[PDB]
Design a protein. Structure first.
Length: 75
């Protein structure tokens, strides 16, 4: 139940702050030039916003390595 990054590709809980929790589809898209991100949440936790754990995603069909060309890839 850690929704914020899980929300990157799941339009439900529109929230983001600081790190932005861009970890999933947003990050995989531009950085590893993946096809999509799998926005799942850490099921072991149920955390209500400002989820400092909620950086968890698979970059599907990631075509590149960690890349720096995008400001949203700076992390």
């Amino acid at each position: 139940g850690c929704f914020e990054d899980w929300s990157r590709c799941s339009p439900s809980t529109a929230s983001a702050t600081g790190v932005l929790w861009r970890s999933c589809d947003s990050y995989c898209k531009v950085c590893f030039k993946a096809d999509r991100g799998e926005c799942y949440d850490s099921p072991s936790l149920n955390c209500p916003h400002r989820l400092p754990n909620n950086k968890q995603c698979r970059c599907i069909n990631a075509r590149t390595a960690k890349d720096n060309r995008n400001p949203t890839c700076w992390a």
